Amino acid sequence: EIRTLTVERLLEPLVTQVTTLVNTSKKAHVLAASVEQATQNFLEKGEQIAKESQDLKEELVAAVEDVRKQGETMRIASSEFADDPCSSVKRGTMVRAARALLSAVTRLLILADMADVMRLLSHLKIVEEALEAVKNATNEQDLANRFKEFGKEMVKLNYVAARRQQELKDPHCRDEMAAARGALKKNATMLYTASQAFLRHPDVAATRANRDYVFKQVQEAIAGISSAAQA
């Protein structure tokens, strides 16, 4: 089971059409027709997904093509089944074709989910590194510049993470991710202020300790986002 509203919404229609068709001459052709409809509009959504993706693009395209083939096989098998409903052999061919189709679909979706997660994680690593550079700055000018860079990454990460957050079906996961994201945002300001406090008083041990501690909180928050995002 993969939990994502996009996955569930793309899956639902096709799977229900197919399941119904597998569970039952004029009307059989109708069911087959519905399955073909579901198949083709799912195919639309799929090639769109393939286009939009920035990670694992080629693979997604291939997976879409594979869905196209299994869809054709399924159509043929299902019409030949429709023409002769009580045929056990034709039924068997149809059902095998159906399993093959759903499997292809499933592969496509799992691949896609993986692409999304990988985008998010890429952003997270980039932001983590930018904040580490904030932590390690040695004067007010370079601190300001590293924070400038961090901001530019942070805005990319924020939409991606929010999008992901919107996809999670389980509200426990959803809200957990919201808290990790809030914590990251909060700790970025605290990191900046702590680094400022250290630069202003490098003599005082408390400041270096607090800066270090905050950066640890940042790392926890980031880990928390990636964890909650992978359900």
Side-chain angles (χ1 to χ4, degrees), residues 2 4-8 10-11 13-23 28-36 38-43 46-47 49-50 53 56 60-67 69-89 92-95 97-98 100-124 126-165 167-168 170-171 173-175 177-199 201-207 209-215 217-231:
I2 168 184
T4 275
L5 302 180
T6 298
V7 157
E8 194 183 75
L10 293 183
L11 258 199
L14 189 72
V15 173
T16 43
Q17 314 265 247
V18 167
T19 314
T20 302
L21 169 65
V22 167
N23 295 335
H29 262 288
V30 166
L31 306 191
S34 289
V35 172
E36 182 68 8
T39 303
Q40 204 65 20
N41 59 44
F42 176 96
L43 261 190
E47 253 301 332
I49 292 188
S53 180
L56 308 183
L60 281 193
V61 189
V64 174
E65 165 79 341
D66 184 27
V67 170
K69 297 184 195 307
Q70 310 307 318
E72 179 58 32
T73 293
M74 175 61 176
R75 181 179 61 82
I76 294 183
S78 289
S79 83
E80 289 179 2
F81 168 87
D83 291 330
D84 190 19
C86 311
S87 166
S88 289
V89 176
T93 302
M94 197 213 65
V95 166
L101 178 56
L102 294 186
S103 168
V105 164
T106 301
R107 244 199 319 284
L108 174 62
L109 301 184
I110 286 185
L111 193 62
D113 184 78
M114 226 169 307
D116 294 336
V117 167
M118 278 193 52
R119 197 150 61 244
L120 178 63
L121 259 71
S122 192
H123 287 335
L124 285 173
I126 298 177
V127 162
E128 181 157 329
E129 261 142 11
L131 285 171
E132 185 150 6
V134 169
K135 178 208 181 172
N136 290 330
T138 50
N139 62 95
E140 282 246 84
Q141 188 58 235
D142 293 327
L143 167 70
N145 296 334
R146 305 292 74 81
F147 193 76
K148 183 184 70 198
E149 300 168 14
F150 152 72
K152 291 175 181 164
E153 304 300 331
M154 178 61 221
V155 72
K156 290 311 153 206
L157 164 66
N158 173 66
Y159 169 82
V160 172
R163 194 168 58 183
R164 182 59 182 187
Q165 183 179 311
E167 300 253 293
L168 304 184
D170 183 17
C173 302
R174 203 144 37 87
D175 290 338
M177 186 159 174
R181 295 183 57 238
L184 175 61
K185 308 234 186 73
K186 166 204 180 193
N187 288 313
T189 28
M190 290 181 63
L191 181 52
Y192 182 85
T193 61
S195 306
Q196 237 174 349
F198 169 75
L199 300 185
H201 312 272
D203 31 41
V204 181
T207 65
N210 182 241
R211 164 194 249 176
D212 295 333
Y213 174 75
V214 172
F215 183 63
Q217 289 307 99
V218 163
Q219 283 167 328
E220 283 185 34
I222 286 177
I225 297 157
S226 65
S227 169
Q230 290 155 113

PDB file of all heavy atoms in Angstrom, residues 25-50, unseen atoms left out:
ATOM      1  N   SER A  25     -23.743 -10.385 -22.578  1.00  0.00           N
ATOM      2  CA  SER A  25     -22.771 -10.095 -23.630  1.00  0.00           C
ATOM      3  C   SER A  25     -22.817  -8.641 -24.085  1.00  0.00           C
ATOM      4  O   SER A  25     -21.783  -8.060 -24.415  1.00  0.00           O
ATOM      5  CB  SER A  25     -22.995 -11.006 -24.836  1.00  0.00           C
ATOM      6  N   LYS A  26     -24.014  -8.062 -24.125  1.00  0.00           N
ATOM      7  CA  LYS A  26     -24.165  -6.665 -24.522  1.00  0.00           C
ATOM      8  C   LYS A  26     -23.542  -5.750 -23.476  1.00  0.00           C
ATOM      9  O   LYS A  26     -22.880  -4.764 -23.812  1.00  0.00           O
ATOM     10  CB  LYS A  26     -25.639  -6.309 -24.723  1.00  0.00           C
ATOM     11  N   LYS A  27     -23.750  -6.102 -22.208  1.00  0.00           N
ATOM     12  CA  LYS A  27     -23.286  -5.297 -21.083  1.00  0.00           C
ATOM     13  C   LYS A  27     -21.801  -5.514 -20.807  1.00  0.00           C
ATOM     14  O   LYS A  27     -21.103  -4.605 -20.348  1.00  0.00           O
ATOM     15  CB  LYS A  27     -24.102  -5.613 -19.826  1.00  0.00           C
ATOM     16  N   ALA A  28     -21.323  -6.722 -21.086  1.00  0.00           N
ATOM     17  CA  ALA A  28     -19.907  -7.032 -20.933  1.00  0.00           C
ATOM     18  C   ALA A  28     -19.065  -6.112 -21.816  1.00  0.00           C
ATOM     19  O   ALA A  28     -17.994  -5.644 -21.413  1.00  0.00           O
ATOM     20  CB  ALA A  28     -19.644  -8.483 -21.270  1.00  0.00           C
ATOM     21  N   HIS A  29     -19.563  -5.842 -23.020  1.00  0.00           N
ATOM     22  CA  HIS A  29     -18.911  -4.901 -23.925  1.00  0.00           C
ATOM     23  C   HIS A  29     -18.910  -3.496 -23.340  1.00  0.00           C
ATOM     24  O   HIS A  29     -17.983  -2.721 -23.572  1.00  0.00           O
ATOM     25  CB  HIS A  29     -19.599  -4.889 -25.292  1.00  0.00           C
ATOM     26  CG  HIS A  29     -18.919  -5.737 -26.322  1.00  0.00           C
ATOM     27  ND1 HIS A  29     -17.711  -5.389 -26.892  1.00  0.00           N
ATOM     28  CD2 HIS A  29     -19.277  -6.912 -26.889  1.00  0.00           C
ATOM     29  CE1 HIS A  29     -17.354  -6.319 -27.760  1.00  0.00           C
ATOM     30  NE2 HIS A  29     -18.286  -7.255 -27.775  1.00  0.00           N
ATOM     31  N   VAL A  30     -19.960  -3.169 -22.590  1.00  0.00           N
ATOM     32  CA  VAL A  30     -20.066  -1.859 -21.969  1.00  0.00           C
ATOM     33  C   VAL A  30     -18.979  -1.723 -20.919  1.00  0.00           C
ATOM     34  O   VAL A  30     -18.222  -0.755 -20.934  1.00  0.00           O
ATOM     35  CB  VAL A  30     -21.452  -1.630 -21.337  1.00  0.00           C
ATOM     36  CG1 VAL A  30     -21.421  -0.420 -20.419  1.00  0.00           C
ATOM     37  CG2 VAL A  30     -22.492  -1.456 -22.423  1.00  0.00           C
ATOM     38  N   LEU A  31     -18.896  -2.708 -20.026  1.00  0.00           N
ATOM     39  CA  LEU A  31     -17.832  -2.757 -19.025  1.00  0.00           C
ATOM     40  C   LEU A  31     -16.454  -2.612 -19.674  1.00  0.00           C
ATOM     41  O   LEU A  31     -15.632  -1.812 -19.228  1.00  0.00           O
ATOM     42  CB  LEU A  31     -17.894  -4.059 -18.229  1.00  0.00           C
ATOM     43  CG  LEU A  31     -19.247  -4.366 -17.580  1.00  0.00           C
ATOM     44  CD1 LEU A  31     -19.128  -5.533 -16.609  1.00  0.00           C
ATOM     45  CD2 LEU A  31     -19.822  -3.135 -16.888  1.00  0.00           C
ATOM     46  N   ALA A  32     -16.214  -3.373 -20.738  1.00  0.00           N
ATOM     47  CA  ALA A  32     -14.958  -3.272 -21.476  1.00  0.00           C
ATOM     48  C   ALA A  32     -14.729  -1.857 -22.010  1.00  0.00           C
ATOM     49  O   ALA A  32     -13.594  -1.366 -22.049  1.00  0.00           O
ATOM     50  CB  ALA A  32     -14.936  -4.279 -22.621  1.00  0.00           C
ATOM     51  N   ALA A  33     -15.814  -1.203 -22.410  1.00  0.00           N
ATOM     52  CA  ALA A  33     -15.737   0.153 -22.934  1.00  0.00           C
ATOM     53  C   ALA A  33     -15.299   1.106 -21.838  1.00  0.00           C
ATOM     54  O   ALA A  33     -14.423   1.955 -22.044  1.00  0.00           O
ATOM     55  CB  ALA A  33     -17.076   0.586 -23.510  1.00  0.00           C
ATOM     56  N   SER A  34     -15.916   0.949 -20.674  1.00  0.00           N
ATOM     57  CA  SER A  34     -15.589   1.762 -19.519  1.00  0.00           C
ATOM     58  C   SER A  34     -14.121   1.591 -19.162  1.00  0.00           C
ATOM     59  O   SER A  34     -13.405   2.576 -18.962  1.00  0.00           O
ATOM     60  CB  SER A  34     -16.478   1.393 -18.333  1.00  0.00           C
ATOM     61  OG  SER A  34     -17.808   1.837 -18.542  1.00  0.00           O
ATOM     62  N   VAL A  35     -13.678   0.337 -19.100  1.00  0.00           N
ATOM     63  CA  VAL A  35     -12.280   0.030 -18.832  1.00  0.00           C
ATOM     64  C   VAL A  35     -11.363   0.734 -19.833  1.00  0.00           C
ATOM     65  O   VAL A  35     -10.338   1.297 -19.452  1.00  0.00           O
ATOM     66  CB  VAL A  35     -12.023  -1.484 -18.861  1.00  0.00           C
ATOM     67  CG1 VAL A  35     -10.529  -1.784 -18.781  1.00  0.00           C
ATOM     68  CG2 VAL A  35     -12.768  -2.163 -17.718  1.00  0.00           C
ATOM     69  N   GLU A  36     -11.744   0.739 -21.106  1.00  0.00           N
ATOM     70  CA  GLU A  36     -10.936   1.420 -22.114  1.00  0.00           C
ATOM     71  C   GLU A  36     -10.883   2.937 -21.900  1.00  0.00           C
ATOM     72  O   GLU A  36      -9.832   3.577 -22.109  1.00  0.00           O
ATOM     73  CB  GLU A  36     -11.464   1.114 -23.515  1.00  0.00           C
ATOM     74  CG  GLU A  36     -10.654   1.755 -24.636  1.00  0.00           C
ATOM     75  CD  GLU A  36      -9.255   1.170 -24.777  1.00  0.00           C
ATOM     76  OE1 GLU A  36      -8.944   0.156 -24.108  1.00  0.00           O
ATOM     77  OE2 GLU A  36      -8.463   1.724 -25.572  1.00  0.00           O
ATOM     78  N   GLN A  37     -12.018   3.506 -21.495  1.00  0.00           N
ATOM     79  CA  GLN A  37     -12.095   4.930 -21.189  1.00  0.00           C
ATOM     80  C   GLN A  37     -11.131   5.245 -20.054  1.00  0.00           C
ATOM     81  O   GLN A  37     -10.173   6.011 -20.228  1.00  0.00           O
ATOM     82  CB  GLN A  37     -13.526   5.342 -20.817  1.00  0.00           C
ATOM     83  N   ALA A  38     -11.385   4.616 -18.908  1.00  0.00           N
ATOM     84  CA  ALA A  38     -10.536   4.715 -17.726  1.00  0.00           C
ATOM     85  C   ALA A  38      -9.056   4.579 -18.070  1.00  0.00           C
ATOM     86  O   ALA A  38      -8.212   5.332 -17.563  1.00  0.00           O
ATOM     87  CB  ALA A  38     -10.943   3.655 -16.705  1.00  0.00           C
ATOM     88  N   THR A  39      -8.750   3.630 -18.949  1.00  0.00           N
ATOM     89  CA  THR A  39      -7.373   3.375 -19.349  1.00  0.00           C
ATOM     90  C   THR A  39      -6.782   4.568 -20.074  1.00  0.00           C
ATOM     91  O   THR A  39      -5.647   4.979 -19.804  1.00  0.00           O
ATOM     92  CB  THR A  39      -7.255   2.141 -20.267  1.00  0.00           C
ATOM     93  OG1 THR A  39      -7.803   0.992 -19.611  1.00  0.00           O
ATOM     94  CG2 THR A  39      -5.795   1.877 -20.612  1.00  0.00           C
ATOM     95  N   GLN A  40      -7.552   5.129 -20.998  1.00  0.00           N
ATOM     96  CA  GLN A  40      -7.001   6.192 -21.820  1.00  0.00           C
ATOM     97  C   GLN A  40      -6.883   7.510 -21.052  1.00  0.00           C
ATOM     98  O   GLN A  40      -5.895   8.243 -21.213  1.00  0.00           O
ATOM     99  CB  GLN A  40      -7.829   6.376 -23.086  1.00  0.00           C
ATOM    100  CG  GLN A  40      -7.042   7.006 -24.238  1.00  0.00           C
ATOM    101  CD  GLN A  40      -5.903   6.124 -24.751  1.00  0.00           C
ATOM    102  OE1 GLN A  40      -5.884   4.909 -24.528  1.00  0.00           O
ATOM    103  NE2 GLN A  40      -4.948   6.742 -25.447  1.00  0.00           N
ATOM    104  N   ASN A  41      -7.856   7.818 -20.198  1.00  0.00           N
ATOM    105  CA  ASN A  41      -7.743   9.072 -19.454  1.00  0.00           C
ATOM    106  C   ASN A  41      -6.658   8.959 -18.355  1.00  0.00           C
ATOM    107  O   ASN A  41      -5.907   9.929 -18.098  1.00  0.00           O
ATOM    108  CB  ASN A  41      -9.111   9.525 -18.900  1.00  0.00           C
ATOM    109  CG  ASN A  41      -9.756   8.522 -17.970  1.00  0.00           C
ATOM    110  OD1 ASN A  41      -9.104   7.949 -17.092  1.00  0.00           O
ATOM    111  ND2 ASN A  41     -11.071   8.333 -18.135  1.00  0.00           N
ATOM    112  N   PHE A  42      -6.524   7.771 -17.758  1.00  0.00           N
ATOM    113  CA  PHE A  42      -5.358   7.519 -16.916  1.00  0.00           C
ATOM    114  C   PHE A  42      -4.072   7.716 -17.708  1.00  0.00           C
ATOM    115  O   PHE A  42      -3.077   8.182 -17.164  1.00  0.00           O
ATOM    116  CB  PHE A  42      -5.363   6.109 -16.323  1.00  0.00           C
ATOM    117  CG  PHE A  42      -4.117   5.788 -15.519  1.00  0.00           C
ATOM    118  CD1 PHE A  42      -4.107   5.937 -14.141  1.00  0.00           C
ATOM    119  CD2 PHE A  42      -2.953   5.337 -16.141  1.00  0.00           C
ATOM    120  CE1 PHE A  42      -2.964   5.649 -13.406  1.00  0.00           C
ATOM    121  CE2 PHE A  42      -1.809   5.061 -15.413  1.00  0.00           C
ATOM    122  CZ  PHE A  42      -1.816   5.218 -14.049  1.00  0.00           C
ATOM    123  N   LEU A  43      -4.080   7.326 -18.980  1.00  0.00           N
ATOM    124  CA  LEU A  43      -2.888   7.466 -19.807  1.00  0.00           C
ATOM    125  C   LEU A  43      -2.532   8.936 -20.027  1.00  0.00           C
ATOM    126  O   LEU A  43      -1.343   9.308 -20.082  1.00  0.00           O
ATOM    127  CB  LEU A  43      -3.079   6.766 -21.151  1.00  0.00           C
ATOM    128  CG  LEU A  43      -2.475   5.368 -21.282  1.00  0.00           C
ATOM    129  CD1 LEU A  43      -2.518   4.911 -22.733  1.00  0.00           C
ATOM    130  CD2 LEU A  43      -1.052   5.374 -20.770  1.00  0.00           C
ATOM    131  N   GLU A  44      -3.571   9.756 -20.164  1.00  0.00           N
ATOM    132  CA  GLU A  44      -3.407  11.206 -20.247  1.00  0.00           C
ATOM    133  C   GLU A  44      -2.669  11.722 -19.014  1.00  0.00           C
ATOM    134  O   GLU A  44      -1.569  12.307 -19.122  1.00  0.00           O
ATOM    135  CB  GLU A  44      -4.768  11.903 -20.379  1.00  0.00           C
ATOM    136  N   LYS A  45      -3.272  11.477 -17.847  1.00  0.00           N
ATOM    137  CA  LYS A  45      -2.677  11.906 -16.574  1.00  0.00           C
ATOM    138  C   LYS A  45      -1.226  11.424 -16.438  1.00  0.00           C
ATOM    139  O   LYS A  45      -0.349  12.155 -15.958  1.00  0.00           O
ATOM    140  CB  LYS A  45      -3.516  11.402 -15.391  1.00  0.00           C
ATOM    141  N   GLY A  46      -0.979  10.205 -16.903  1.00  0.00           N
ATOM    142  CA  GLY A  46       0.347   9.623 -16.851  1.00  0.00           C
ATOM    143  C   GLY A  46       1.386  10.319 -17.714  1.00  0.00           C
ATOM    144  O   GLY A  46       2.510  10.567 -17.258  1.00  0.00           O
ATOM    145  N   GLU A  47       1.045  10.627 -18.961  1.00  0.00           N
ATOM    146  CA  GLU A  47       2.028  11.303 -19.802  1.00  0.00           C
ATOM    147  C   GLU A  47       2.263  12.732 -19.285  1.00  0.00           C
ATOM    148  O   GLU A  47       3.392  13.237 -19.341  1.00  0.00           O
ATOM    149  CB  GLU A  47       1.604  11.303 -21.279  1.00  0.00           C
ATOM    150  CG  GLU A  47       2.411  10.330 -22.173  1.00  0.00           C
ATOM    151  CD  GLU A  47       3.925  10.605 -22.189  1.00  0.00           C
ATOM    152  OE1 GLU A  47       4.329  11.770 -21.995  1.00  0.00           O
ATOM    153  OE2 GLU A  47       4.720   9.662 -22.408  1.00  0.00           O
ATOM    154  N   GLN A  48       1.214  13.367 -18.755  1.00  0.00           N
ATOM    155  CA  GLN A  48       1.398  14.654 -18.071  1.00  0.00           C
ATOM    156  C   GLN A  48       2.436  14.543 -16.950  1.00  0.00           C
ATOM    157  O   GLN A  48       3.398  15.317 -16.903  1.00  0.00           O
ATOM    158  CB  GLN A  48       0.076  15.170 -17.496  1.00  0.00           C
ATOM    159  N   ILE A  49       2.237  13.575 -16.055  1.00  0.00           N
ATOM    160  CA  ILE A  49       3.204  13.295 -14.990  1.00  0.00           C
ATOM    161  C   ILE A  49       4.621  13.119 -15.525  1.00  0.00           C
ATOM    162  O   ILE A  49       5.580  13.648 -14.963  1.00  0.00           O
ATOM    163  CB  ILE A  49       2.834  12.024 -14.197  1.00  0.00           C
ATOM    164  CG1 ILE A  49       1.556  12.245 -13.394  1.00  0.00           C
ATOM    165  CG2 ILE A  49       3.969  11.624 -13.269  1.00  0.00           C
ATOM    166  CD1 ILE A  49       1.226  11.127 -12.447  1.00  0.00           C
ATOM    167  N   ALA A  50       4.740  12.369 -16.612  1.00  0.00           N
ATOM    168  CA  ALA A  50       6.037  12.134 -17.228  1.00  0.00           C
ATOM    169  C   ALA A  50       6.684  13.447 -17.653  1.00  0.00           C
ATOM    170  O   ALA A  50       7.884  13.655 -17.447  1.00  0.00           O
ATOM    171  CB  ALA A  50       5.893  11.205 -18.414  1.00  0.00           C
TER     172      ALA A  50
END
